Design a binder for this molecule. Structure first.
Ligand SMILES: CCCCCCC/C=C/CCCCCC(=O)OC[C@@H](O)CO
Ligand SMILES: CCCCCCC/C=C\CCCCCC(=O)OC[C@@H](O)CO
Ligand SMILES: CCCCCCC/C=C\CCCCCC(=O)OC[C@@H](O)CO
Ligand SMILES: CCCCCCC/C=C\CCCCCC(=O)OC[C@@H](O)CO
Ligand SMILES: CCCCCCC/C=C\CCCCCC(=O)OC[C@@H](O)CO
Ligand SMILES: CCCCCCC/C=C\CCCCCC(=O)OC[C@H](O)CO
Ligand SMILES: CCCCCCC/C=C\CCCCCC(=O)OC[C@H](O)CO
Ligand SMILES: CCCCCCC/C=C\CCCCCC(=O)OC[C@H](O)CO
Ligand SMILES: CCCCCCC/C=C\CCCCCC(=O)OC[C@H](O)CO
Ligand SMILES: CCCCCCC/C=C\CCCCCC(=O)OC[C@H](O)CO
Ligand SMILES: CCCCCCC/C=C\CCCCCC(=O)OC[C@H](O)CO
Ligand SMILES: CCCCCCC/C=C\CCCCCC(=O)OC[C@H](O)CO
Ligand SMILES: CCCCCCC/C=C\CCCCCC(=O)OC[C@H](O)CO
Ligand SMILES: CCCCCCC/C=C\CCCCCC(=O)OC[C@H](O)CO
Ligand SMILES: CCCCCCC/C=C\CCCCCC(=O)OC[C@H](O)CO
Ligand SMILES: CCCCCCC/C=C\CCCCCC(=O)OC[C@H](O)CO
Ligand SMILES: CCCCCCC/C=C\CCCCCC(=O)OC[C@H](O)CO
Ligand SMILES: CCCCCCC/C=C\CCCCCC(=O)OC[C@H](O)CO
Length: 464
């Protein structure tokens, strides 16, 4: 009878929950770099703009990493429904912290809250969407597509609204709007969830057995102790600047898949695991370029574009806009393309090439016009158009090609975005007006080349 776009009514609740959470997240992301610039300009924040860019990237890296952990905590300890609720509460607090009359001193607390909160909420709302359907329900894929539409919608409207609020009423009010966005999500989630969600998910579905508690405690304790020890040694040898800590986090984020790879390669489907390395690197490099949209392209938007008549943060709406515009087209495409549809490794290769082209495009205005003036907003429009085209090729088959090639390596796909952002934490420090053309050219061309490399390797990989 009555449905939400053909789906169970409970999808409306989760749709709105994620829409408003993504609203809060991308609303914050769209103005946070500019906020740090402001704090730097007033002498409140004693870092370079390069470091501010680095912060944005490592922030994203840790958000993605945290998301690979939240599912475990919900499934084994607190339950998916409380994970979403309390995750949302932490996220809201994270935005409230930036709305308070503080300056740079509140940045770290806000970042930590949102990292933990998003880690709790993001994997677990997706889990709850699954719970709406039986195993044999063929509506499942349609339901997730609608859910993703809500995600992109929140991501789309947030820079517009939060960016406009920032211009009108300042950063603290704008950040409060992000907080209010999460609050709306929590309201709908809490009261809507009670109506449609299975009570089963109020509790962990795979609770720790009695003998499992101590080994988990030891595991967590040793990890924390090791991490703290590393920080201690860092401060003793004088490696205690902010870039030093960012480097530590970069190393951690990259070492986790590296250790996974070394583990699987050591421990004869050995060929498959090795075959995934080029795909994983391609994913990492793609996500690096895609995630630079809120950092390097955001910098370009503010410094190099004729945008005096609208909030420059609005450029961040282009990424989810193009995802929304492309999605129904590629949905039709992969069904219509019956004969000789490209393999998943081929999609990765071409996807990386489009990401490469998105940067090669951005090298053109500086090379043609110089880098001291300002250029058309359409250069950025074209860039996002290209990189998102790449996303349509690599993202829908990413988890698929990883699974078909089990629980540890599955997480590596989600880790690719974390690793890409960790790489960005290093790379974006190289971007400035002087290096602009070389930056876009070099990393653009590199991605295209590595895409061409993957094309040659596509035949061998598809067989495994
Ligand atoms: C076939 C569907 C593919 C959709 C993606 C295509 C996007 C391609 C974009 C490349 C051209 C955009 C850059 C052009 C540009 O900057 O012109 C500036 C000039 O108009 C200044 O007024
Ligand atoms: C300023 C930095 C603070 C760092 C964040 C501190 C808070 C960290 C974790 C709090 C989240 C705990 C969520 C679990 C909870 O409260 O209920 C779970 C349980 O009741 C469900 O069965
Ligand atoms: C310091 C400012 C933030 C203080 C947070 C106070 C409100 C926190 C979360 C709002 C959640 C909205 C859903 C309302 C709710 O869950 O109330 C539950 C109540 O009816 C019985 O559990
Ligand atoms: C996990 C995959 C890792 C692959 C990373 C590929 C790129 C890694 C390091 C490149 C650093 C050197 C870039 C130096 C550079 O050309 O900067 C350009 C600009 O600053 C002036 O040319
Ligand atoms: C299958 C659809 C997507 C295919 C993408 C086709 C891409 C083909 C060629 C890309 C040309 C790359 C140009 C490299 C370049 O101009 O670098 C010059 C600059 O680095 C000077 O230092
Ligand atoms: C459990 C996996 C997630 C790991 C969470 C640890 C995240 C720790 C730090 C996040 C990165 C933030 C670094 C930038 C930063 O701290 O800015 C603070 C301001 O510079 C204050 O001067
Ligand atoms: C630190 C300030 C935050 C205060 C939050 C309000 C606390 C009052 C009640 C908490 C209710 C916790 C409900 C957890 C939960 O699983 O919600 C799920 C809903 O049942 C819908 O799935
Ligand atoms: C029941 C708790 C749920 C609360 C939802 C989040 C509320 C967030 C902000 C409320 C309004 C905060 C206004 C911020 C503000 O005063 O800006 C100060 C200006 O900078 C002063 O010029
Ligand atoms: C890094 C922040 C998140 C850290 C969460 C890891 C928690 C640390 C050790 C595991 C202890 C979890 C509590 C055990 C529990 O509640 O389950 C009890 C068993 O189900 C009873 O047999
Ligand atoms: C410094 C952080 C390193 C990790 C230490 C975190 C310790 C946090 C919680 C440990 C709680 C001890 C586990 C015992 C427990 O939870 O029993 C609960 C059961 O439900 C009782 O039947
Ligand atoms: C439950 C929260 C526990 C904290 C999460 C663990 C990660 C903690 C720190 C990671 C390193 C980030 C330090 C950033 C920072 O503020 O350094 C600034 C230095 O004072 C440089 O002068
Ligand atoms: C399973 C992941 C475990 C991997 C963690 C291993 C971390 C090992 C070493 C971290 C060293 C931190 C680097 C500090 C650094 O980059 O130099 C400091 C600045 O460059 C100079 O101030
Ligand atoms: C009605 C257009 C489709 C919906 C656009 C949503 C808003 C997304 C981005 C707005 C900021 C970037 C657009 C700037 C722009 O396109 O300017 C083009 C003109 O040629 C300006 O010179
Ligand atoms: C229903 C799927 C088919 C929809 C067709 C999508 C094509 C829409 C826009 C393509 C924009 C192409 C940009 C043209 C261009 O690059 O012109 C460059 C000139 O040199 C600028 O002066
Ligand atoms: C289906 C895509 C077909 C190919 C798309 C266009 C490929 C991109 C560029 C092709 C022409 C390359 C010209 C490069 C070029 O002239 O650079 C100028 C010099 O580097 C300036 O010093
Ligand atoms: C399929 C559409 C692709 C549209 C983008 C194609 C871009 C192809 C080549 C652009 C490379 C421009 C590099 C310019 C350059 O490096 O010259 C340096 C100048 O002398 C200034 O440093
Ligand atoms: C199937 C996806 C491929 C889409 C490629 C369509 C774009 C084709 C050509 C766009 C090349 C970008 C360079 C445009 C350019 O430099 O023109 C100069 C501007 O007119 C400056 O006023
Ligand atoms: C797949 C169905 C949806 C297709 C979306 C079409 C978007 C594709 C490309 C948008 C790139 C915008 C560049 C606009 C442009 O270069 O025009 C230049 C002007 O003609 C010169 O003033």
């Amino acid at each position: 009878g009555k449905t939400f776009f053909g789906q169970p009514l409970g999808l409306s609740t989760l749709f709105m929950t994620e829409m408003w959470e993504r609203f809060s997240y991308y609303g914050m992301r769209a103005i946070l770099l500019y906020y740090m610039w402001f704090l730097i300009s007033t002498g409140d924040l004693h870092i370079t703009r390069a470091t501010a860019a680095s912060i944005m990237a490592i922030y994203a890296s840790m958000v993605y990493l945290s998301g690979t952990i939240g599912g475990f905590v919900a499934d084994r300890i607190i339950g998916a429904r409380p994970a979403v609720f309390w995750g949302g509460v932490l996220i809201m607090l994270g935005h409230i912290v930036l709305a308070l009359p503080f300056g740079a001193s509140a940045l770290f607390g806000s970042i930590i809250l949102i990292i933990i909160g998003t880690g709790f909420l993001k994997p677990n709302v997706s889990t709850l969407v699954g719970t709406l359907y039986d195993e044999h329900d063929r509506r499942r894929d349609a339901g997730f597509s609608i859910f993703v539409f809500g995600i992109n919608l929140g991501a789309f409207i947030a820079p517009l609204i939060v960016g406009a609020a920032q211009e009108a009423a300042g950063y603290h009010v704008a950040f409060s709007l992000a907080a209010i966005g999460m609050f709306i999500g929590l309201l709908v989630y809490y009261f809507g969830g009670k109506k449609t969600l299975d009570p089963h998910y109020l509790r962990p579905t795979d609770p720790l057995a009695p003998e499992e508690v101590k080994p988990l405690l030891v595991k967590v304790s040793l990890a924390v102790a090791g991490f703290i020890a590393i920080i201690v040694v860092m401060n003793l040898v004088g490696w205690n600047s902010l870039p030093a800590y960012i480097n530590l986090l970069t190393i951690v984020a990259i070492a986790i898949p590296v250790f996974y790879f070394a583990w699987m390669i050591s421990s004869t489907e050995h060929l498959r695991v090795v075959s995934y390395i080029p795909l994983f690197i391609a994913a990492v490099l793609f996500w690096a370029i895609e995630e630079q949209g809120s950092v390097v392209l955001a910098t370009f938007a503010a410094e190099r574009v004729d945008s005096s008549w609208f909030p420059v943060s609005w450029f961040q709406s282009l990424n989810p806009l193009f995802i929304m515009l492309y999605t129904p087209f590629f949905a039709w495409l992969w069904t219509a393309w019956k004969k000789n549809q490209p393999s998943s490794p081929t999609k990765f290769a071409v996807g990386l090439m489009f990401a490469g082209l998105s940067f090669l495009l951005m090298a053109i205005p500086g090379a043609l016009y110089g880098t001291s003036g300002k250029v058309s907003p359409l250069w950025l429009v074209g860039s996002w158009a290209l990189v998102i085209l790449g996303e349509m090729l690599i993202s829908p088959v990413g988890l698929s090609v990883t699974t078909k090639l089990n629980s540890q390596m599955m997480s590596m796909w989600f880790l690719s975005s974390s690793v890409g952002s960790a790489l960005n934490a290093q790379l974006v420090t190289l971007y400035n007006a002087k290096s602009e053309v070389a930056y876009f050219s070099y990393f653009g061309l590199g991605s295209v080349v590595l895409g061409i490399v993957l094309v040659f390797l596509s035949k061998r990989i598809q067989g495994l």
